[PDB]
Structure formats: C-alpha cells, structure tokens
Amino acid sequence: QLTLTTSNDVFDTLLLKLIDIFNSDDYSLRIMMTLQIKNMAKILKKTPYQLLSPILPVLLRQLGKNLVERKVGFQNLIELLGYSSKTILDIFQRYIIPYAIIQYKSDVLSEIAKIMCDGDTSLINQMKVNLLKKNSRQIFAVALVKHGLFSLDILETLFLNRAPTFDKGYITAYLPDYKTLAEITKLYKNSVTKDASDSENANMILCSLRFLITNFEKDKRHGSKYKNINNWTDDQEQAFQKKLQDNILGIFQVFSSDIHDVEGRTTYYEKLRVINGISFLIIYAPKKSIISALAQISICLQTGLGLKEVRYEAFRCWHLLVRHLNDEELSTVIDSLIAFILQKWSEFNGKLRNIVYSILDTLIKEKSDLILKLKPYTTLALVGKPELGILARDGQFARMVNKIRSTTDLIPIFANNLKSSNKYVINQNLDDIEVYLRRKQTERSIDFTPSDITLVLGALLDTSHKFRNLDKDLCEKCAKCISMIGVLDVTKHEFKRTTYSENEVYDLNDSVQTIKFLIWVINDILVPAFWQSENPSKQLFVALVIQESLKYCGLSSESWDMNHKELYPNEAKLWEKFNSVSKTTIYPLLSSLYLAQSWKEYVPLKYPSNNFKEGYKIWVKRFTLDLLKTGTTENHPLHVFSSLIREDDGSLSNFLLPYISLDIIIKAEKGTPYADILNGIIIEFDSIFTCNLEGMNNLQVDSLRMCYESIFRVFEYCKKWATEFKQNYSKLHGTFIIKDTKTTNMLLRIDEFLRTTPSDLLAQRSLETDSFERSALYLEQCYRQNPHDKNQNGQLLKNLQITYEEIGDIDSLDGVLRTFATGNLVSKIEELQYSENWKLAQDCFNVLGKFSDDPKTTTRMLKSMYDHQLYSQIISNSSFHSSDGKISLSPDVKEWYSIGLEAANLEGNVQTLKNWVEQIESLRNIDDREVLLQYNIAKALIAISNEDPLRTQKYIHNSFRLIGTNFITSSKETTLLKKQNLLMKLHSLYDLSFLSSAKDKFEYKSNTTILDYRMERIGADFVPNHYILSMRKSFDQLKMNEQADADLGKTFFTLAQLARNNARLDIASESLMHCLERRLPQAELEFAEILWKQGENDR
Amino acid sequence: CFLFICDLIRIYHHVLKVPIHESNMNLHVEPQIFQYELIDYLIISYSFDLLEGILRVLQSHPKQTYMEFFDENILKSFEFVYKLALTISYKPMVNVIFSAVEVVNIITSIILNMDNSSDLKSLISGSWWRDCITRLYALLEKEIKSGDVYNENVDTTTLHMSKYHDFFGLIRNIGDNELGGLISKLIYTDRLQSVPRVISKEDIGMFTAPIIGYKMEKWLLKLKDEVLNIFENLLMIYGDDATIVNGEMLIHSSKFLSREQALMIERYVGQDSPNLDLRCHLIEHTLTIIYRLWKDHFKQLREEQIKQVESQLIMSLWRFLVCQTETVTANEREMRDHRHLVDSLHDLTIKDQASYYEDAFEDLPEYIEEELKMQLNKRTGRIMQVKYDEKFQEMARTILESKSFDLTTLEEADSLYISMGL
C-alpha cells in the first residue's frame, strides 16, 4: 500500500521493488509477497498478469542473464502470473532473446528452446533459428547500443555459433532496415537527470545511426571508427542529414505500427519506448526531418495522451516538441492537444498539472506568435477555463488577452473547427460557443449581418447530424448551442449552398481533368483527413493514397521542388493550385516510400447478398470496396483509394461511390466482366429500393434512408456528368452534337441507367426520405413520361399534394388541387384551408371529423387546427376526451398525442397539462420520436410550476438530447424553411431554461429584456413569433410570481398586436382580453385597431 | 405450489435478465415510469420468497414424508430458477439471491436430516451441484463495502442491493423499505381499476444516514455466512468424494479467508462500524470450512490444487498462529482502552441490552459481569486481529504443522516461525 498511493512511473518502479523481494529466497517474504500481490491485483480489478505485465519486459529481461541458476525464481514468477512457462515466453521473446543471445557462450538459449518447443523430440534447431530470425531486429539493436558491436563479422560469427543453421551470415542487408533503426532509437532512455551514462547510450545510438544509413555499402565491414563520436568530420554530416530523411517516414511507420497495436500484442512498455524514440528523433535529428513527418508524431502523441499510463511521457515528449520547433509549423498540431488539456484537466494529478503548466508557460512566453495572432482561439480557450488559471501566472499575458478577444472575429474559426474529427476539440468548441453566445446575449451585439452566424449554425447542424448514433452528449450540447443562436430570419440569412460551382464534374478519361480531380480531392478532403486521423494506420493509408495520387500526376519520382531545376513550368503551375495549408503537408511525401498493398485475402462477394443487417457504414464501405477493386485494374488512379475504405467512417466511401460507379458505366458492349458487375449493382439498387421497411425499428430505417441517399447521389452524378460531357463534347470537339456512334453508346448506358429501377419508385422511396423537392422532381418525371392522358393520376396525386404541403409552396398545391383532381367535393374544401377562408374549412372538418369512421380524417382536422394555431381548440377536442381520458397504446394516436401535448404546452394551464402526462405515463413502450419531445417539454413545464429549477433543467436537457440525436438533420442540403420548424422549438427550449434560471426578480427582469432582444433576430413571420410568445406566455402563468404576471400581460399585449398586424385578429381579440383582467391602460387603444381590422370603422 | 411458482418465475423471464450495461445511445428520453417495473419486481421477489416459504414449511413436516414433495420436476424447475437468480451475465437482483441460496440451504439441511437420504441424492445429478456450487463460488468472491452498497457500480463484484428494488419482502426485512410507500401509491384507493397508478421513477432518492449501509452490509455478511454454511453442510452430505467436494473448497474458501483477513487488518480495525465482529466471524467460520476439509476430506485434496493456493492457505493459517505470541492483551486495564478504540458500538449494544432487554442483566452479582469482562475481552481481541480464540489457533496449527501434506519444508516452516518469535 505504498505502491497503491503512487502513479505511472513510481508505480512501475515500486512493482519491481515488490518483485525483487518476492524472490528474496526468504520463504516468509515470498509467501507474504504472493498474498499481497494477489490481493493488490484483485483490489485494482485486475489479474496479476495484467498487473505485472507492464514490468515483465524489465523484470525477466535480467533473468536472461541467470535463467539456468534462477530456474526456481522463474518458476515462482510463472506460477504467480497464472500462465504456462511458454505462454509468457513467446509473448515476451522480444525482450530477453536480445540479451540471452549476446551474453557468454554457455547459453541459456538451450533452456528457452526447451520450453519454447515442448520436448527435445521436437527439434530445437529449426525453432531456435526461426526464433533467432523472429526478433533479429531487436538483437541488431541491442548489439549496436548495449555492447557497441560495429563490426559485421562479429555479428555474423556471434550468430553462427549460437545457430549454425542460420542463413548465409545474417539475413542480408537488413541492418539499414526501418525496423532496425526504430529498435535502435527505442532504447533512448531520457530523464530530467542528464547523466554521463545517459549521454553514453545517446552517443552510442547516434553513432549506430551514423553507421547504418549514410555509408552502408561503403562500410559494411569497416565500422570500428564509427564507435568514436568526435571523429565525425563535417564532410559527412550533410550526407547523414540527406540519408536520414529518406529513412525517417518508414521508421515512423514502424512506430505507428507498434503504438496503435490492433491485436493486443503488447502492453504500454512498447508505447513508452516508442515515445522515447520520438523524443530522441526530436532532439537528435535535423530540423527538415522533423518538419517533414510532423503529422506522424502528432497522432502518435495523441494515442500516447489517450492511453492513461503513458500520458506523462507523452506530455514531456510534446514539451520537447513544442520548443524544438517554430511558430507557424505548430499551428497544424496545437488544437488537438490544447483541447486535450482543457477537456481532460480534471483527472490530472499534481505531476501532470505541473508538466502541463510547463507546456503552457513555455507556449505563452517564447511562442506567443502562434498563440496571439496566428490563431487567437488557442489563447481564448485557455482563458475560458478558470480552473486552469492562466492570467495570474504571467500578468503581462493578460495585457495581450484583454485585446486579443476584441480585435479577432471568432465565428469562422468556430466554423472550420467544428468540421474536425476527434471528439476533444469539438467538445471544447461547444463549451466555448455556449459561453461565447452567453456573453454576446448580455453584450446585446451579436452580429446578424444581412463572419456570419449562419456559418456556425450550419456547422452545428452538420456536427449534430454527424454524431446521431455516437455520443449523445455532444449532440445535446450542440443542440443547446443551436438554441442559444435561435431562429434566424429566413429572408436575410442563408447557408453556403455551393451547388452552382465547379460542381464536382471531372472526366476520368482525359489527363488534364483527371489531374484536376486528383489535386482537388487532395486539396479539400485528403489533406484535412491527413491531419485529423484517429488511429495512425488511417493516417498512413491517407499518406499512401495522397502519395500515389501525386505519382499519377507526375510529381513524385522525379524531384523538382527544390527550385534548382526550374525547367519544370508544367509542374510548377500544376503545384501552385495546391494551397499553402496543403502545400506544407504535401511537400514531404513526394519522395516517400509508402507501400501498403497487402493483398489476396479479399474474396469478392456477389452483389445481391446484402449488407443491410449490420448497418449503413458497413454496407457502403463493403459495396464501394466490392466495386472499385473489381473495375479499376491498378492503372486508373482510383485504384489506390481502396486502402482508405477498410477504416472509413462511411463518408469517404460515399464520396467515391459516384465516381467509381460512373467509371464502371463507361465500360461498353458488355464483353468484359466490368459490365457483369454493373448487372450486380443494378440488382443491388433493386435490393435497396424494393425492401420491407416494416418489422424494424427506427434505426434500420435510418440506415435505409442513408442507403437511399448514397445512391441517389450516383444517379444525379451520372446525369450531371453525362450532360456536361455532351456540353463540352459539343463545345470543343466540333459543334454539331452527334459523332462516331460509339460515345453515343457510352451515352445510352447512362440512359438505361437512369431509366432502370424507374420512377413512381424513386419518388416512393424519396418522399419518405424527407427530400421533398427530389420527390417532387421524380413525381413530375413520372407525370410526363407516364401517359397522363390515362388514369394513373389517382395514385399519382394522393402523395403529390403531400410533396407540396410541407415543401412550403402553396401556389402549386392550390394549382394541383384545382386541376385534374376535381372529383370529390372534400378536395374543393381542402382548398379553403390555404386561401384566407381557412375557418370556413375548419368547421367543415369539425363535422367531417366527427363521423368516427376513419382514423385519418381526425388527424387531418388536428393538423389543420395546429397549422392555424388553434391550440385551445385542440386541447378541448372530443377526439381525446372520451369522458376524461384517452385510449391505450398508439397505432396512429401517436400522431394525435403529439399534437395534443404540443397544444397543451402552448396554452399554459397546469391542470390540462398535468393530467395529460398522467395519460402518457400510463403507456408501456413509447416508440414515437415526436411524442417524447413535447412530453419532456410538458414535464419541464410541470416541474417549473412546482418551483423546481434543477428538475426542469433536467427535462429541457432531455429535450435537447432528443432534438440533437433524432430530430436534427444535415445542413448544406436542406433549406432554412424546413429547419425553421425545429429552430422555433429550440428557441422555445432555450428561453424556458433562461427564465427558469433565476432566483429573484432582479435577474428575471434582465432575462425578460434579453428575451425581448431575442425577439429581434426572430424575423417578422407570424408562426415563430406566436410560438415563442406562446411559450413565454405558458411560462408566465405556470410560475405565479407577480412579476411573472406583469410579464404575462406584456406577452398577451404583444401577442395581440402581433396577430392584428398579420391578418389573424381571431386570436388577437381573445389574447387582448387577457389584458383586461389586468386592466392595462393601453388595451383601450389596441381594441380600436382590432375593431378597425375587423371591419367596423365607426366603433 | 412450488411448481407453480417456479414456472411463474419463468413466465416473468425478463426481470432477472436485464443486461449489465446499455447502449451509449440508450437515450433516457422516455416517460421514466416505475409502476410496471415495481409490479414485476414485486412478483419476482414475492415468488422467490414464496419458494423459500414452501421449503421451510416442508422442512417442518415429519421426516418420513419428504418424498411426497420431491421428484424430477421439483429439482429441474429449481435448477432453472436458481441459474436464473444467481446470475452471471445480467444485472443481479439481490432480493432473489438471498432466497435462492436459502432454498439451497433448506435442501442440504433436509438431506442431512432425513432418514432415506438416498432418494433425494439419487434424484440429484452431479451437474445440478456442479452448476450450483460454481455460482456459490462466484457469489462468495463478491465484495461487501458500505460506501457503495446502494451505488450502481461495476458488475458481479459488489453485492449492491439496487435502488429500484428496495422493499422488505415476505420473510425478512432486507433494506430500509424505501419502496414501501409506492406499493400503497400503486393504486388510487378510492376507485376500482386495472392499470396502475402512475409512479414517477426519478422522484425517489433525496444525505441523512450511512447507518442504512451498515445494516445492509450486515445482511450481506450473513449472506456469505449462509453460503459457506451450505458449503459446511454439503461437506457432510458428501463425506465420501464426489464431483463437487473436489478441492476447490480449498481454492475459493482460502482466497476468501486470506482476503477477509487482509483487508480486515488493513482497513477495518478502528472504523466504528457494527459489522466488524460478524466480518471476523466469517473468517473464524471459514477456517473450519478449511479444517474439516483438511482433516476429514484429504483424499480428494489434489496435489495440483493445493499449490494453486499455497500462498493464501499458509498465510491465512499464519495470521492465526501469530496470535500465540500475545504480548498485547495480557491484563484488563488496556484492553478496555482498546475496546474504546475499536468496539464502542458493542458497549452501546450491551448497555442497551443490559438496561432494557436482558433478564439476567440486572442486580449483577459479581459473577455475571466477570463473565462479561471475559467475553468482551475475547471479543475485542478477536476484532483487533491479535489474540483470536485458542481453538482456532489449534485448528490452524494442525493443518500447517501436520504431516498429511508437506505445505512447507522444515527449513521453510521455521522461516515462518521466526516472524513471530520461536
């Protein structure tokens, strides 16, 4: 229990101190140590193997010196670990064979062979020579550092007497291997105590690097002079610096292989000594080698920070990195750990907080160029956490803080930070946005320009749509930030809409546009994915693809960028189209040697075997992978991209799916199997569309929506590519658009590809997707191509009018309801509910809906009441009150209960709202996504009437969770006209939290003035204004303060004069009458305008 | 009635089969209702309590007529419901664990106390016991800690008594009965209805006392006393060797003895909890579960299995033989000063028993409190972990020193004896 109080370094030292008194050969000490080690292992909820395995590379390493004498100590250690003597021996063969080989001649290798193969009737020689060939890299490593054997014949002879069956000296030319260089530099022990013994092995591994790389074929044999350090002349230092950086990205590839250990091959001792190797290469290497592979060690140190026991060494390795490197080439990596500092600060002990203080004071004194003006988010984020305490440490840094906040517009650097990948920076951006907007509300000058706030709103919508099935919490706080933004005016605020643009059209046949496609796909999505990768294997695969794309573009194998060539204008003007934030990261790996084919375990599956029963991201990755490896054949430049989609999140697969499918289209006259796999994906699209879609809950249908969208994308890309191909084919190649009857045979296959799985079924599977404009497009296509003289216009139109009545457009809905659809009179009644005589249609629906023959003619009445704000008339309906209560579990009554809860919220009455949730909570398993939102808002209001602030905050946070995971969708695709129905609910969820968060009237009045400020960004449309004022109304009459009642009269007066300016004085009168029990001195004037708009002038 | 309650529990199959951990996207946006969960928790707990009640009224019948109760279907149905209760992969309901092991106690206790014991034993397979005893081993190695009984924490290692089923039950009063008001508030009481009255689930919980945690530890320590008590019974049933008295009652019981001596000495001495004595009764009981396994059942204590626990067996015997030194107590004056430090709660207990509840404890004639200042002294010795009872010293002596098996050599044994004196 002295060890239980310690942490990562001292803990591992004290465990070795536990074991070297475990083997003290005193019997009492041995049994007491077995007992305490086992109880310590169980009270840490571990086994003794996974307690002592982080020091088993150290403990039994010196037992390679004494494995013949201390057989009983090794036997005690293997009975403590609970494994066999072989099982810990083939997994820790990496650590003791580099010492058991190189020692004195009477080897312990015979016993390690006697255990590593059972019985001498199994032959020890071949197993001995293949274990000696198994870890020969570490043997070379220890031979070069721990003894200084810089003579190759010494290595050869000291092998061949330990194994005479060893192949032709050593396994030849494997000394300048990347793995041997990595295992050399992993043995750089480093501490704050720079000792002479710590400089000795530092110089030894530096001189072994000098032996291995700069002159190997010159100096295979004569290497005894390299053991000296200072005989290294300046004739050979720059040749060493040249040969080091053709030989540094692969040793970081080996480092990336053995940090992110995928099969559980090793513990974190490997990770500690990889971080030691990174630290050695940060100190002892030229600067151009470290500017080069910075994005290797970034996501090596990220995995070091992520794992718990290797955090301190990785912070110290960053501290080494942050000062051996300049200001501007540090911007690429500073966000990912300033986020880790600010988001994982709480569990840091004293030592980790001291080393992070030593990060930050170094970063703010000597490298304030990065922190202040190169990216000012990294200082405002550190100021934004008061638990850290930046400003008291310097004091003069506060002089820079209190002017760097003002002069830097902060919105677009929240915008391009929310498109990141790792969860730490997009929790810090959310925690900074919810404090930024909270400051800007009280500051009353958040910008709404007719630096746009709609940029960060679109970023937040895309962030919440990205994480709909992963980490509900950041979608919660993301939707809370969207609510803090509020409803934008839909007129003067719009998203980016990069649709009429360069528009992703690239011919994959000509060279001049294929190179433009590759430079575009490198610039916009491969360069960001190169930095923001999670595991380093994905970053290596992105590096491979982004290298081979440069190799196809004629930039890699020859080198020209040093400007000493200059006879390459065709390559320089090509290179200039890269931007600098991609240029700096694409420059090193022109000459790199990434090669990760890894083939012949592929098994191409035939197509209609569907992948739907696993997920969407399973399906699109497997389908894209089944396509592009069966239709490219290693010369077309989309072949390398297959290395990305065994670790994709589904985004890059969905990106490349139209391009690879369109390149499979142009393979003609079936002939080859390239059109045989086309017939596979036609029936795979048939498997997508003609599916069941019932019998499954609300997540397999969500995956089916995504499977719809991913292959609507390929249809519009085939159509777009074919039309631009016709356009530029008739533009440049002649003018008369017909030629040669063979590119016409290309253009016919898209035409049967856009007429297969045909319409009446694109529209059927797209209107349920909620892309209502796309469904309207396919419905009009299957109006024109369908012979519309015939009578298919009955089943065509019962959903065609649905595709207009929530698209926003009325003037075609009113035009289709009165043209070729005039059979039934009820259809003529449904024209009235959009044309100013809506109440003439309401009371017709009230008696059509009181026939009790259909379930849907009731919900037509309820939706028509809700669309015309008749909330009090919804909650008084007899469709719910049979006598007092409602019916059981809900086939279609969920569509009724949603409207009922929402109207019960919008009229604030605790009795009609408090017994509605008595009926909701009598149900068993509420599946409906839409009921539970208004339920949670209802119980927020019921708790807010019980003067209970934390409970109503709890239920409003439930509402934000449900909106951020379920209701919310993708930005940059939809309008703002369809997001607005959700933004009004979010804007009404924020003001309930903002009016509940008050203790007395002094801040309650200030909250109401801030909400009146929030009623100025709202626009002037009637529906969101009436919704938000109805929710402040429902707050102010469930909390029976007298100041809330004085607020309530103001809300009713604003509802009244809102509704009489919007030609809806039906409710302006019955809202102004609430201002007469209070007897305001102003309602005598307001009733005059209500009388005026009604039509009576003289009164 | 037994067969009906067993297949009644297999009807309510899903109450004892909620998973350990839920989805990360298991959104808790839901009406959060407790009334149906309260009903089927009451159904399962009253059903298991009724199984215990059936078997204890069957235990009270004359001892010639047990075969009118038992057949194949009784034991198959209880085998199913016992695998259901003492779960492995699902969230444990502790209410049914008490009753499900007390049923096994009643079964072993009547196999010991019937004349035609063969018919029960020939009716029971070996697989029934070797599926029972492994779940008892998995129950005996769980942790009992006051500060996180009523917490929801890591699975299958802490007996924890969930917040959402905290009521009494039909035999024994097991929690503080926090869900007893909700049984009354499950109906409208002025109305004739079928659906339940709505009980909000997150209204419960409101911080005053961790004494509730101490008495729930008291029940869980009696539960472990129960488990190793039915171990003690089925040593006596299967006095001859079988599949089940098979040497793993050295492994699991010596792990238990060694750890509950270890964290007693490291953690509990001077912690003024009521549950110390019972916790140092468990060790004092399980030594005997070692001891009669050592003396009377050595024919199956296999040599490979003894060395799996040779650490813990020898160390646990050593922590009894260390008490033969006894340079701590030796008098009366400082022992009562020690029991002010470790055992003041039992002074409160014996004064409340003496002034209210014990007929012998008034007009104490200076021979009945000179037994009290013998037995409080040996109690506080047995709590202070130095000076246990002499009989348990002898039982621990005649395992290590005795030559039925060479645990230690003669030069390894005196290395243990020098760490006392000797």
Side-chain angles (χ1 to χ4, degrees), chain A residues 34 921-922 935 951 955 961, chain B residues 28 31 35-36 202 266 311:
Chain A
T34 51
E921 285 171 338
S922 295
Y935 170 76
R951 190 181 293 270
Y955 289 111
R961 289 165 69 192
Chain B
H28 297 284
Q35 66 269 16
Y36 295 97
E202 56 93 23
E266 293 179 355
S311 175

Side-chain angles (χ1 to χ4, degrees), chain B residues 123-205 207-288 290-322:
Chain B
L123 184 62
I124 293 168
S125 65
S127 66
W128 186 75
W129 293 108
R130 69 180 182 270
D131 292 332
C132 179
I133 300 301
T134 62
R135 294 179 184 270
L136 293 171
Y137 288 159
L139 185 63
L140 187 65
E141 290 181 352
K142 292 182 180 180
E143 295 177 353
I144 299 169
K145 301 293 188 291
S146 179
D148 57 356
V149 174
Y150 292 99
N151 192 0
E152 295 295 326
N153 55 2
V154 64
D155 56 352
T156 65
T157 59
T158 61
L159 294 173
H160 67 278
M161 187 65 198
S162 177
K163 180 173 71 70
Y164 297 103
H165 53 84
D166 190 359
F167 57 89
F168 279 163
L170 296 174
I171 296 95
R172 62 182 62 87
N173 303 117
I174 199 69
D176 57 352
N177 197 2
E178 195 271 331
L179 301 179
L182 296 178
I183 299 169
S184 66
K185 291 187 286 185
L186 188 62
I187 60 170
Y188 291 102
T189 196
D190 59 356
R191 188 178 295 172
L192 184 64
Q193 73 275 19
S194 179
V195 299
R197 186 179 178 182
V198 173
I199 297 169
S200 179
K201 188 172 74 174
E202 56 93 23
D203 61 356
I204 59 172
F207 63 97
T208 56
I211 304 298
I212 300 168
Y214 285 161
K215 63 177 71 67
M216 190 64 208
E217 282 188 345
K218 185 72 179 295
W219 288 106
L220 293 174
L221 294 175
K222 292 181 182 180
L223 181 63
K224 285 188 175 180
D225 194 4
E226 187 71 30
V227 174
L228 65 93
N229 205 164
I230 70 175
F231 289 163
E232 181 179 0
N233 288 322
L234 65 92
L235 291 174
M236 294 171 66
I237 296 168
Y238 296 97
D240 56 354
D241 296 331
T243 304
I244 60 169
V245 178
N246 55 2
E248 281 82 3
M249 287 182 183
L250 288 177
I251 288 93
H252 294 88
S253 64
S254 64
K255 289 176 73 69
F256 181 74
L257 176 60
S258 66
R259 68 99 180 269
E260 292 292 328
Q261 289 175 353
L263 49 81
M264 179 67 75
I265 291 169
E266 293 179 355
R267 297 295 296 163
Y268 289 104
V269 175
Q271 198 177 5
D272 68 5
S273 295
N275 296 319
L276 301 180
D277 183 74
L278 182 60
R279 190 181 292 273
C280 61
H281 183 271
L282 293 176
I283 57 96
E284 189 178 3
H285 188 190
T286 185
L287 180 65
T288 62
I290 299 296
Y291 178 73
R292 194 176 67 245
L293 183 63
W294 184 259
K295 183 175 71 67
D296 292 333
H297 294 88
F298 183 73
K299 276 74 67 179
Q300 191 63 41
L301 299 180
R302 292 178 66 187
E303 191 272 333
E304 181 66 27
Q305 291 175 353
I306 298 171
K307 288 183 178 180
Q308 293 182 358
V309 288
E310 185 178 1
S311 175
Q312 298 175 355
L313 182 61
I314 294 174
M315 188 66 198
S316 65
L317 298 175
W318 185 75
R319 295 186 188 274
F320 290 108
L321 274 74
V322 69

Side-chain angles (χ1 to χ4, degrees), chain A residues 391-451:
Chain A
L391 282 78
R393 294 179 66 87
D394 194 5
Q396 291 180 356
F397 186 70
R399 289 179 174 89
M400 301 300 107
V401 167
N402 292 114
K403 69 181 180 67
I404 202 64
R405 187 178 296 115
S406 179
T407 189
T408 63
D409 190 75
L410 194 65
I411 299 297
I413 60 174
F414 288 123
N416 58 5
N417 282 320
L418 288 171
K419 68 181 182 68
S420 175
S421 70
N422 50 357
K423 292 166 67 174
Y424 293 100
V425 70
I426 58 174
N427 289 318
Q428 184 59 38
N429 286 118
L430 297 181
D431 292 334
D432 283 329
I433 286 169
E434 71 180 1
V435 173
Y436 179 74
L437 297 175
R438 189 178 296 117
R439 287 189 291 111
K440 293 294 183 183
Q441 290 180 2
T442 59
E443 195 268 328
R444 298 286 179 88
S445 178
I446 182 66
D447 198 3
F448 295 105
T449 300
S451 66

Side-chain angles (χ1 to χ4, degrees), chain A residues 1050-1078 1080:
Chain A
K1050 186 185 290 182
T1051 61
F1052 280 114
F1053 181 74
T1054 54
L1055 280 167
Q1057 68 183 358
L1058 173 68
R1060 59 98 173 170
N1061 287 123
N1062 289 113
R1064 197 188 163 89
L1065 71 153
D1066 293 327
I1067 63 102
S1069 66
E1070 65 94 22
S1071 67
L1072 188 64
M1073 296 302 108
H1074 292 281
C1075 297
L1076 294 180
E1077 196 274 330
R1078 280 90 172 93
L1080 273 76

